[PDB]
């Protein structure tokens, strides 16, 4: 049983949980949910939607998946695996998604414009370890048409922790700008070194995205692992900034109910308390 963390004995939950090569830390971790029990999963185990699938085992659950429109003459393709998650007491405040295939690149730039969101993030290199882990969905330069959906990039600046796209997407009726915030430091065997540069890009993703628009596209690989970090992250601080309080085991639980397994390993599970101590020491 996990309660409840206060700030002021974060530090030395941290330094408890992790002895032992973090013995309490893997115990906490391997408590969780999955999150396949309760759910049903019809929909993206339908036939149809077998090739938009990356892995066939990481689908998002029929309740809490994003619907797309359906188009006109082609049955079951109102798919996507994305599913909505909840934020701090915020329904709904993201959408984690896998990366798109390039099968699934219009259907993917189609949920962004239906789903009225602003921000993508974007958590994967293309490739890493030397497989493709993303399709690329946008252009370099120019535009490029995607379906039904315009895509002109305005914009591009390359930091040494993370790069951030700006792109004016339309059907082909007024334009909106869609900044993506593309993290490519992440590495290709375990987690960051330090949180000190996933605090920094947390920070930059909230300045960015606007107060009105529709829920942030959070995606990596498959959508559940780093994509379940970024966002309890986010949902963490802002519970230690209202409450005083953490409470991760709860969160993760509560967010598999909408997408199953997010937070993939128990090093992603100890980089997320490192991230709070991080933040709650010097942000």
Not at 162 to 189: E, G, M, N
Not at 243 to 259: A, L
């Amino acid at each position: 049983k996990y309660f409840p963390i206060p700030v002021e004995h974060l530090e030395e939950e941290i330094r408890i949980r992790s002895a032992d090569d973090c013995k309490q830390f893997r115990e906490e971790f391997n408590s969780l949910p999955s999150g396949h029990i309760q759910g049903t999963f019809e929909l993206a185990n339908k036939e149809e939607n077998r090739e938009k699938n990356r892995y066939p085992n990481i689908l998002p659950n029929d309740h809490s998946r994003v619907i797309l429109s359906q188009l006109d003459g082609i049955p079951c393709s109102d798919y996507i695996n994305a599913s909505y998650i909840d934020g701090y007491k915020e329904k709904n405040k993201f959408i984690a998604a896998q990366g798109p295939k390039q099968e699934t690149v219009n259907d993917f730039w189609r949920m962004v414009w239906e789903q009225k969101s602003a921000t993508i993030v974007m958590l994967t290199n293309l490739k890493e370890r030397k497989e493709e882990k993303c399709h690329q969905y946008w252009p370099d330069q120019g535009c490029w048409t995607y379906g039904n959906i315009r895509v002109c990039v305005e914009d591009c600046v390359v930091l040494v922790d993370y790069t951030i796209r700006k792109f004016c997407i339309q059907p082909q009726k007024a334009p909106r700008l869609v900044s993506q915030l593309h993290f490519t430091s992440w590495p290709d065997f375990g987690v960051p070194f330090t949180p000190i540069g996933m605090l920094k890009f947390l920070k930059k993703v909230k300045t960015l995205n606007p107060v009105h628009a529709g829920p942030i596209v959070v995606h990596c690989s498959a959508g559940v692992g780093r994509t379940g970090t970024f966002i309890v992250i986010d949902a963490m601080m802002a519970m230690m900034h209202a409450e005083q309080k953490v409470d991760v085991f709860e969160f993760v639980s509560r967010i598999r109910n909408q997408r199953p397994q997010m937070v993939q390993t128990d090093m992603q599970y100890t980089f997320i308390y490192q991230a709070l101590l991080e933040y709650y020491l010097y942000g």
